[PDB]
Amino acid sequence: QWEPVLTEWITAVLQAPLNETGVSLSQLSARNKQVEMEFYLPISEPLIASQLDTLIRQFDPLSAGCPPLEFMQVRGMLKGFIDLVFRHEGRYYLLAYKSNWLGEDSSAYTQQAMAAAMQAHRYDLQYQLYTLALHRYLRHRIADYDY
Amino acid sequence: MLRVYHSNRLDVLEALMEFIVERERLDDPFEPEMILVQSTGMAQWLQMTLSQKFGIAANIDFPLPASFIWDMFVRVLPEIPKESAFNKQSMSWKLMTLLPQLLEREDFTLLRHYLTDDSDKRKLFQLSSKAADLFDQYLVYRPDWLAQWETGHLVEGLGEAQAWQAPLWKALVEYTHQLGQPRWHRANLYQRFIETLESATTCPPGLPSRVFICGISALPPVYLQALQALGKHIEIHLLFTNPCRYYWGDIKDPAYLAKLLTRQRRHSFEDRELPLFRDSENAGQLFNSDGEQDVGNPLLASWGKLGRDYIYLLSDLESSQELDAFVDVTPDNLLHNIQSDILELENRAVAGVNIEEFSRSDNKRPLDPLDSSITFHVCHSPQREVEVLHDRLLAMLEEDPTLTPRDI
Amino acid sequence: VTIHKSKGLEYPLVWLPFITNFRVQEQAFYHDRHSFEAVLDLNAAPESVDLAEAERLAEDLRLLYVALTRSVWHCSLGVAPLVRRRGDKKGDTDVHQSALGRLLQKGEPQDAAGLRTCIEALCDDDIAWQTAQTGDNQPWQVNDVSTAELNAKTLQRLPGDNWRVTSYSGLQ
Amino acid sequence: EQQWQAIIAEGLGAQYGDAVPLSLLRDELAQRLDQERISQRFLAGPVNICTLMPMRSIPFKVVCLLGMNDGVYPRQLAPLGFDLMSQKPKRGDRSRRDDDRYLFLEALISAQQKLYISYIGRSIQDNSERFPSVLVQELIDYIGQSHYLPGDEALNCDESEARVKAHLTCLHTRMPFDPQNYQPGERQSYAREWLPAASQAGKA
Amino acid sequence: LDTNWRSAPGMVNSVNKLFSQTDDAFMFREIPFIPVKSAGKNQALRFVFKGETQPAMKMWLMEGESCGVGDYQSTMAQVCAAQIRDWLQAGQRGEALLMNGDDARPVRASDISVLVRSRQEAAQVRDALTLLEIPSVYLSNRDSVFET
Amino acid sequence: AETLDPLRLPLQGERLIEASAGTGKTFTIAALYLRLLLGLGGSAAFPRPLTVEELLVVTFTEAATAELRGRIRSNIHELRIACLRETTDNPLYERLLEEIDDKAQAAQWLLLAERQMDEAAVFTIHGFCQRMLNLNAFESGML
Predict the structure, then answer these.
(1) Is C155 near chain B, with CB under 8 Å?
(2) Are C1 and C8 in contact (CB under 8 A)?
(3) Is A141 near chain B, with CB under 8 Å?
(4) Are B290 and B303 in contact (CB under 8 A)?
(5) Longest Cα separation, chain A
């Protein structure tokens, strides 16, 4: 019974553009898209949380609250699975999917509630590692690259 | 051009792959880079080494050789679905329906004596699964047998089981012709795939820029004959790990021995021509009458039959470009002595044919009593064995200050 | 070690204290002397019981041959006039019903003096006999020795640093 | 649900029309539920514990081998009997015995610094001699015929081979609390929990 | 096979003397006994005691007219334990030896073995041997560890 | 009955060997295995030499089969060394070396026997029955 509502909800998601210029998902060709990019990221220094969280809080505006997480000194490799990477008009973009969303049923999911969810679930570190991995990938692949 | 990279260890092949990627960059950034592996740990180690060398390792696809070959079948030749109609479970469920219909034949009286004694549909599914696994092995390895069984003619010189295997396969090919399933499978497609690449003038679209074959030491001749036609158009880099630097395979004919003697490798960095055999004038005396080379090292002759067949299958390719990057190991330790004896293709085992070689014992290699490279341990139980192993690994970690448990 | 677990092994000195003890088979399960097939007689016929007891005695003789031929240097046997019958003094003993007494008394029923004369008849340089003496003087001597000093090695540093290939979920 | 629907989809892909019993689907689900393997932590950084997997040779500094006795390794998989590939072998044919021998060769070559080999030689039940595999026997034969100790420089060929094979063979004790392991010398145990048990200096 | 390579020729002659008293000693017509021959390399094997050279087979005849089962087992177990402690007490002083030609070996506790048929008489031998401060192992013990 | 020589035994038809207690039965099995591998005996020999996967040895105890396999492997290695050296220290091995005329082909056959020792057909009774039931399952009717 959920299927005829599910297909119209999927088409309503696909018709909604997600860009600062208004680019929808239907304008992306097969060569432009890449789904589930798996990356390995090396690190040779002991990852100190105190030297990293201050560097994040120096530039990221969402780190006003969010008291810092505690983790051990991690030296080695880091795995990651990016949901979607796509290019458009000579510009690369990243796309991830979050779909739990249990506590909202009304139209209260504004930018403030989404920013509070990003600060609560701590997806800022994941997005920053995704930007670092995408920057290293576009630096290794494309010659004469600017961020 | 098909490039073949012979090396003793895998780090030289990883450095050569790094030099290939840094030398020639991809024109399409979102194009995945095909690196053919066999297991997940091999792909994981390749991802970790490419991330260590480049700073990143992403958009690198590691498919199976059969999956990559079927993907190239889909991309080159049209009207082919993404999945094969002839799979193991599909042929098992087809043969479970086809075998009761074929019990009335005279050729299937053995299966009738095996099946009609007692059947709660248990022996039928086991026979269908085993015959489907054998048919999958025939689709991978023996396409000529299935091509002759599709017409209905027998092959001279096979076993008795062909007497029930030739009408069982052909009635399978009719059955997928009877249903809405497609006709095409792996056996009948490889010859058309080889011919349509040799007969074409322009390259077909959709093909990748460069394909890597790393960590793979066993392939059928059908897959290599397809990859030769694939490498005639698109540059494919084959990184093959061989323990010996000389030719240590078999031979086919004396007219093929001269063709192998005319082929010479060249170094990747030194760019100098190096021969295959240690002696070119005495190369004919090494091979036997049937075509097997008398390998001097007994361990390589006794353990490396799969690599001995694989280097013979690689040397049989016409348009193959062979490159050798062998880093020599200085024989100081016992393990380095064994690796140097395998790589240099020499026999250090003293048989003692004469009494002068049997009396003296200083003609062998000296082994230091502190050399703990190769040790053999006798234990009494599986608990005590790993209990000894834990203490020995602790001693090895204490002996070397720079030693990672990841490297163990 | 039992006789079945000593087949194919090797022992320097072998002591056989209960080689004269025998057990009578009661069930009637024998083999025919012509067809060589297993015949099970459910009725208590005396011929089937005797034909099963003959195979039981042959099995006891084979056990005796297995147990005797495992010694290398010296073997010792325990012989006694054992009577399986409930009568104490009946004038005859049941050693002829065993495996050792069938070779000692040549398959003939005799007495304890007859068993002693049959033992003393086959006396050579390799085969001798003595009486069983009940007596103990001292158990043993320990003769212990001291133990040398021994220690265990200790690892100086940590075995490994915190090296692990994780994801975003491992850091959260 | 995924395995059940996959089994029914693979059955209906061939359009099976006849009846199918319950025990066949039960045995098929029991076989498919145990088919899965895990290899996620193969090279995470801790020391790797895995079986010998063919066509996977990675260079390591220390390579240890366990269970190299006879019968256990090489893993023998008997042919079906009615297979025609076993009757007339070709070049590209693959067998599990040759794959295990090539795996042992790749384990010998892939070892960089240290090679450890341990096999069960004595039985824990009846103290019976358990012979090692043919590959390890050929390896120790080539070691004894290719190398010699500096103590006996020129004694014999077979005697020096047996002396090398006895010097390499470390016959460990049956029990961990034996004082032979804690004797100072070449090999010494790192188990400090059995050290007062081996010292025999405890109250009864 | 004519030649026997395991035992001393005294034990071989004792076996060929005991089993060739009558014809068809194994009581079946199709099972014949033949006198085996000892080895040439093992013809100097001698189990020597403190007194003199001990013979091969020593049939310890328990004296008496008629005896029971448990009393005979107890007396022969005590005689066997006395012989074991006499072989071990004189063996640790260099008196009882195993001599191959001129080579000699002292008799340890692993050389003497008691051959029984049942578990009850094995426990009887072990109880009669542990009373004289002699430890003994049972190789044929097939009891489960979960029943202790 | 007659005496048994391991180098003069006719390997035709059915033969009954009665190995007494303490005799070298395990040595005689290895001697007959080397005789069947190299094809020795002359007129009383096998009509053709056989490989390792064609010699069937049946022993009940599994540990006895493992011990016999190890002893046959050691005998194969010792006879290969004695054939490469054309000399030995054992009299039965001396007569075995005296029975063959060629040395290189026998040494190559012993090397191939040493390499094929893992695929030796030395099984138990129930193991041989299970292998024959799983191998030729059609005529037998086994799952």
Answers:
(1) yes
(2) no
(3) yes
(4) no
(5) 54
Instruction: Give the whole-angstrom CA distance, residue B301 versus residue D138.
Output: 12
On chain C, the residues whose CB falls within 8 A of the CB of B404 are 160, 163
Subunit contact C154:D190, Cβ cutoff 8 A:
yes
| Residue indicated by tokens 């695929």 | F119
Q: How far is CA B170 from CA B112, B162, B175, in A?
A: 19, 12, 9
Q: Report the distance separating Cα B298 and Cα D105, nearest Å.
A: 12
Is B299 strand, coil or helix? helix
Question: Partners for E (CB, 8 Å, 3+ pairs)?
Answer: C, F
Number of Cβ within 10 Å of residue B39's Cβ equals 17
Residues with Cβ within 8 Å of E120's Cβ and at least 6 positions away in sequence, in order, are: none
Sign of CA dihedral A50, A54, A55, A61: positive
At CA A51, angle to CA A46 and CA A53, rounded to 5?
115
Q: Are the beta carbons of B405 and C159 separated by less than 8 Å? A: yes
What residues contact F3, with CB distance under 8 A and at least 6 apart?
E1, E2
Give the helix ranges, DSSP H, for B241-354: 254-262, 298-303, 305-315, 334-343
Q: Are D61 and B408 in contact (CB under 8 A)?
A: yes
Angle value at C-alpha E106, between C64 and E110, nearest 5 degrees? 50
Q: Does C66 reach chain F within 8 Å, measured CB to CB? A: yes
Cα F87 to Cα B355: distance, rounded to the nearest angstrom: 10
Classify residue B55 by its DSSP letter. S
User: Angle at CA C5, nearest 5°, toward C2 and C10?
Assistant: 100
d(CA A53, CA A75): 17
Give the tokens for residue D180: 């032979």
Task: State how far the Cα of F63 lies from the Cα of F77, in Å rounded to an integer.
Answer: 21
Method by which the model was determined: cryo-EM
Give kind and range of the element (H or E) at residue B396: helix B382-399
Q: What are the respective helix, strand and coil percentages of chain F, to the nearest 5?
A: 55, 5, 40
Mutate to test the interface with A, among B18, B44, B49, B51 (most CBs of A within 10 A): B51
Which of E1, E7, E32 lies nearest to residue F19, judging by beta carbons? Answer: E1
Residue B196 CB partners (closer than 8 Å, separation 6+) = B76, B77
